[PDB]
Design a protein around this ligand. Structure first.
Ligand SMILES: [Zn+2]
Ligand SMILES: [Zn+2]
Ligand SMILES: [Zn+2]
Length: 70
């Protein structure tokens, strides 16, 4: 599990194809090493205090782990 806490302004990513809902999100480092960079991804600018869902098998229809966290 990544679980990194986002700072305000940080760039993060959801996947329209795989996210169970629009709040499922990856930090940039996880996103870049994930299957979702080749999907219908959607960038989000953090308000601050959200967290990365990399490794959460409940959050992603495919590829819940990036290469770093597999
Ligand atoms: Zn992460
Ligand atoms: Zn990861
Ligand atoms: Zn995806």
């Amino acid at each position: 599990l990544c679980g990194r806490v986002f700072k305000s302004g940080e760039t993060t990513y959801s996947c329209r194809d795989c996210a169970i809902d629009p709040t499922c999100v990856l930090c940039m480092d996880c996103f870049q090493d994930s299957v979702h960079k080749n999907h219908r991804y959607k960038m989000h600018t953090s308000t601050g205090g959200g967290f990365c869902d990399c490794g959460d098998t409940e959050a992603w229809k495919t590829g819940p782990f990036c290469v770093n966290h597999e």
